[PDB]
Each structure stands twice: as structure tokens, then as C-alpha cells.
Amino acid sequence: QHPSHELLKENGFTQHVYHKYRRRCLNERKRLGIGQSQEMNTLFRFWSFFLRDHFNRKMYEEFRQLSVEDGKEGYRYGLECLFRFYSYGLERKFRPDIFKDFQEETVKDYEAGQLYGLEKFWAFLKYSKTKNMEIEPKLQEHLSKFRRLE
Ligand SMILES: Cn1c[n+]([C@@H]2O[C@H](COP(=O)(O)OP(=O)(O)OP(=O)(O)OC[C@H]3O[C@@H](n4ccc(N)nc4=O)[C@H](O)[C@@H]3O)[C@@H](O)[C@H]2O)c2nc(N)[nH]c(=O)c21
């Protein structure tokens, strides 16, 4: 029924349906204001799921850009979506450039006094089969807090 749900089905993504849906969502974000469009929220959640299995760089960059913007104004649903995309998507297909972004946004989340991102990162490490991942020294320190909860 909802365009996000059509777009998420088996070979259900079409460009004209997505372009229409996106534009309305982004239009309603500007008209009503950040964090005040529920249709925009459906797009954060479409992106979180879609990009796990049909990654596209430009769509990823808008997702990350718009969710980081929302997060600084105080609306964290997009960032929560972003962090799930990182944690579940990098488990499907590891991409070292996306992994570096994941580290950058997690260290930012933690420096803001939040734990949602840091826990998704720890959870990625517990579930992932990727080997010889390079973890930033700063982030390695913050994760060191969860070893005590062992
Ligand atoms: C099996 N599992 C558990 N975790 C992570 O480990 C910690 C403890 O897990 P849980 O207690 O069960 O969730 P919890 O209640 O604590 O918080 P939560 O709200 O659930 O965040 C997670 C949210 O992912 C959404 N969602 C769900 C299903 C799906 N297909 N997509 C989703 O996107 C959904 O919305 C969900 O709620 C949490 O950090 C949790 O994320 C994992 N992480 C990775 N990479 N892979 C995993 O196979 C895995």
C-alpha cells in the first residue's frame, strides 16, 4: 500500500515511483520543518533497509547528510536508522569506506553523550565475520567500557 513498501518488495524498486516519493518527503521536510514530517521518517526507514541490499552511493550520501542534520537539531530517528544500516549492512557486505564513515559517526555520537551508535558498533563487531578491521584508536578506547560488562 505505502510507496516505501512497494519499493522494498522483490524487484519492486522503480525509479519513477522512488523519485515521486522522495520529492514529496523532502518537500514536506522543508515545508513542515526538520523532525516534523512523518513521511520523511518513512524515507529514513526505507533508506535504512533498502541500502543494506541495494547500496547506492548518492542515496547513501543523502541519507547520511540528512540524518546527521536531523540529529544536530534534536531529531535522532534518522541517525538511529543510519546506525542500523551500518551495523546490519556492513554485516551483509563489508565496505571499508562505509566502515570508516561508521567509525566517524559513532565517535561523534559518543562525544555527544549518546550510546545508541556505540552499541550498534559493538554489536557489528560481535556479529561480523570480517577479519583485520582497523579500528580508530579513539573509538577503541570508548568501546573498552563494554569489556567490563563482559
Ligand atoms: C540479532 N541481532 C541483535 N543485534 C543488535 O545487538 C543488540 C541486542 O539486540 P536486540 O535486543 O534484540 O535489539 P534492542 O532491543 O536491544 O535495540 P533495537 O531497537 O532493537 O535496535 C535494533 C533494531 O534493529 C531493527 N531491525 C531488526 C531486524 C532487522 N533485520 N533490521 C532492523 O533494523 C529493529 O528496529 C531493532 O529494534 C542490539 O543493539 C541489536 O541492534 C544485531 N546487530 C547486527 N549487526 N546483526 C544482528 O544479526 C543483530
Author numbering: 796 to 945
Task: Copy the relevant paper text.
La-related protein 1 (LARP1) has been uncovered as the mTORC1 RBP target that regulates the translation of TOP mRNAs through direct interaction. Among other target transcripts, LARP1 specifically binds TOP (terminal oligopyrimidine) mRNAs encoding all 80 ribosomal proteins in a TOR-dependent manner through its C-terminal region containing the DM15 module. To assess whether this uniquely repurposed fold is evolutionarily conserved, we crystallized and determined the structures of both fruit fly and zebrafish DM15 regions in the presence of a dinucleotide analog, m7GpppC, both to 2.3 Å resolution. Indeed, both orthologs adopt a structure similar to that of human DM15 with three tandem, helix-turn-helix repeats flanked by an additional short parallel N-terminal helix and an orthogonal C-terminal helix.
As in the human co-crystal structure, m7GpppC is bound near the C-terminus on the positively charged swath of both orthologs where the Watson-Crick faces of both the m7G and the +1C are recognized through specific hydrogen bonds. Interestingly, the human DM15 region shares 72% and 91% sequence identity with the fruit fly (Dm) and zebrafish (Dr) DM15 regions, respectively. Because the direct RNA-binding residues of human DM15 are 100% conserved in zebrafish DM15, we hypothesized that zebrafish DM15 would also bind 5’ TOP mRNAs. Though the sequence composition of the RPL30 5’ UTR varies across the three organisms, the unifying characteristics of the pyrimidine tract are conserved, suggesting it is a good model TOP RNA with which to probe the RNA-binding profiles of the DM15 regions from the different organisms. Both zebrafish DM15 and human DM15 bound this RNA with picomolar affinity. These data suggest that the zebrafish DM15 region directly binds the 5’ TOP motif. The largest residue-residue contact difference was between 859-E899, within the α4-α6 interface; notably, residue 859 is a lysine in human DM15 and an arginine in zebrafish DM15.
